[PDB]
Amino acid sequence: VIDAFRLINANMMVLGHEPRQTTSNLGHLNKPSIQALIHGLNRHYYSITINYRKNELEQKMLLNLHKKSWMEGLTLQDYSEHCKHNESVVKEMLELAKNYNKAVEEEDKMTPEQLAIKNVGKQDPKRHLEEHVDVLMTSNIVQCLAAMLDTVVFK
Amino acid sequence: DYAKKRGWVLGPNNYYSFASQQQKPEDTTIPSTELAKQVIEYARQLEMIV
């Protein structure tokens, strides 16, 4: 949040003169906020539009600013601990399947929005079931791929 | 005629027919290529918009 201002003339403005000239749409693209109107921006001064103009070299830097070293990309995660995580999530799936069966059974038994409105406390097992996928996937895929590659590139 | 027609060289009175044909040694490399193809495909048609 940035702003840039300059003072309106020291009155002699009972003439009703505009503070500025206009020959473009270019200055009326933005809506002044209520707060500055409270403190009187168009009554005593005026705003001026901020613009950015980056040069070539700094923007070349600015993208590097997050790159991370090649050393890491080829590295494997430990296979132990990894298996532990797999078993954790798979055993977490059960309770959600059990709950899901009831949640399927009971719907349309009442008015439609009164499904959601009565589901603000207890969780809805669909989402928690779904978002444990995208954790077995992604993880298993990328680990198997990385091992499968580097088994060739070194000897 | 059978002997000199088919195999079983009867050297030390032995008629032997090759009936082992094990071959297929530990050959992880052919997996290492085609399985990579396979997994890349799994991830291909998983997030692309259908």
mmCIF file with all atom_site columns, N, CA, C and O in Angstrom, chain A residues 20 39 54 64 88 91 107 118 144:
data_model
loop_
_atom_site.group_PDB
_atom_site.id
_atom_site.type_symbol
_atom_site.label_atom_id
_atom_site.label_alt_id
_atom_site.label_comp_id
_atom_site.label_asym_id
_atom_site.label_entity_id
_atom_site.label_seq_id
_atom_site.pdbx_PDB_ins_code
_atom_site.Cartn_x
_atom_site.Cartn_y
_atom_site.Cartn_z
_atom_site.occupancy
_atom_site.B_iso_or_equiv
_atom_site.pdbx_formal_charge
_atom_site.auth_seq_id
_atom_site.auth_comp_id
_atom_site.auth_asym_id
_atom_site.auth_atom_id
_atom_site.pdbx_PDB_model_num
ATOM 1  N N  . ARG A 1 20  ? -6.046  20.533  -12.373 1.00 0.00 ? 20  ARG A N  1
ATOM 2  C CA . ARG A 1 20  ? -5.216  19.878  -13.365 1.00 0.00 ? 20  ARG A CA 1
ATOM 3  C C  . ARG A 1 20  ? -5.915  19.963  -14.713 1.00 0.00 ? 20  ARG A C  1
ATOM 4  O O  . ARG A 1 20  ? -7.081  20.341  -14.813 1.00 0.00 ? 20  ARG A O  1
ATOM 5  N N  . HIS A 1 39  ? -10.444 12.393  5.324   1.00 0.00 ? 39  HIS A N  1
ATOM 6  C CA . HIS A 1 39  ? -9.426  13.397  5.605   1.00 0.00 ? 39  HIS A CA 1
ATOM 7  C C  . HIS A 1 39  ? -9.187  14.356  4.448   1.00 0.00 ? 39  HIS A C  1
ATOM 8  O O  . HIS A 1 39  ? -8.348  15.252  4.569   1.00 0.00 ? 39  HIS A O  1
ATOM 9  N N  . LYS A 1 54  ? 11.093  -1.936  -14.273 1.00 0.00 ? 54  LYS A N  1
ATOM 10 C CA . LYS A 1 54  ? 12.284  -2.727  -14.018 1.00 0.00 ? 54  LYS A CA 1
ATOM 11 C C  . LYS A 1 54  ? 13.146  -2.820  -15.268 1.00 0.00 ? 54  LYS A C  1
ATOM 12 O O  . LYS A 1 54  ? 12.629  -2.916  -16.379 1.00 0.00 ? 54  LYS A O  1
ATOM 13 N N  . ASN A 1 64  ? 16.221  -15.652 -10.310 1.00 0.00 ? 64  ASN A N  1
ATOM 14 C CA . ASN A 1 64  ? 17.166  -16.569 -9.693  1.00 0.00 ? 64  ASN A CA 1
ATOM 15 C C  . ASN A 1 64  ? 16.957  -16.618 -8.205  1.00 0.00 ? 64  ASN A C  1
ATOM 16 O O  . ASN A 1 64  ? 17.229  -17.641 -7.573  1.00 0.00 ? 64  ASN A O  1
ATOM 17 N N  . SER A 1 88  ? 1.147   -44.958 8.078   1.00 0.00 ? 88  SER A N  1
ATOM 18 C CA . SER A 1 88  ? 0.349   -44.006 8.832   1.00 0.00 ? 88  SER A CA 1
ATOM 19 C C  . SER A 1 88  ? -0.879  -43.584 8.045   1.00 0.00 ? 88  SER A C  1
ATOM 20 O O  . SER A 1 88  ? -2.011  -43.673 8.537   1.00 0.00 ? 88  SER A O  1
ATOM 21 N N  . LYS A 1 91  ? -3.516  -46.464 7.417   1.00 0.00 ? 91  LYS A N  1
ATOM 22 C CA . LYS A 1 91  ? -4.370  -46.730 8.567   1.00 0.00 ? 91  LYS A CA 1
ATOM 23 C C  . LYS A 1 91  ? -5.262  -45.550 8.909   1.00 0.00 ? 91  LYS A C  1
ATOM 24 O O  . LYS A 1 91  ? -6.281  -45.740 9.575   1.00 0.00 ? 91  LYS A O  1
ATOM 25 N N  . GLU A 1 107 ? -28.027 -38.913 3.365   1.00 0.00 ? 107 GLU A N  1
ATOM 26 C CA . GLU A 1 107 ? -28.336 -37.660 2.695   1.00 0.00 ? 107 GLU A CA 1
ATOM 27 C C  . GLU A 1 107 ? -29.701 -37.718 2.011   1.00 0.00 ? 107 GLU A C  1
ATOM 28 O O  . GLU A 1 107 ? -30.313 -38.778 1.851   1.00 0.00 ? 107 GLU A O  1
ATOM 29 N N  . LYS A 1 118 ? -26.059 -28.180 9.248   1.00 0.00 ? 118 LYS A N  1
ATOM 30 C CA . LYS A 1 118 ? -25.932 -29.108 10.357  1.00 0.00 ? 118 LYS A CA 1
ATOM 31 C C  . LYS A 1 118 ? -24.592 -29.825 10.347  1.00 0.00 ? 118 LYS A C  1
ATOM 32 O O  . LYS A 1 118 ? -24.376 -30.732 11.155  1.00 0.00 ? 118 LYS A O  1
ATOM 33 N N  . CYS A 1 144 ? 9.547   -43.160 -6.819  1.00 0.00 ? 144 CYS A N  1
ATOM 34 C CA . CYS A 1 144 ? 9.870   -44.269 -7.701  1.00 0.00 ? 144 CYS A CA 1
ATOM 35 C C  . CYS A 1 144 ? 10.537  -43.763 -8.965  1.00 0.00 ? 144 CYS A C  1
ATOM 36 O O  . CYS A 1 144 ? 11.478  -44.385 -9.470  1.00 0.00 ? 144 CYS A O  1
#
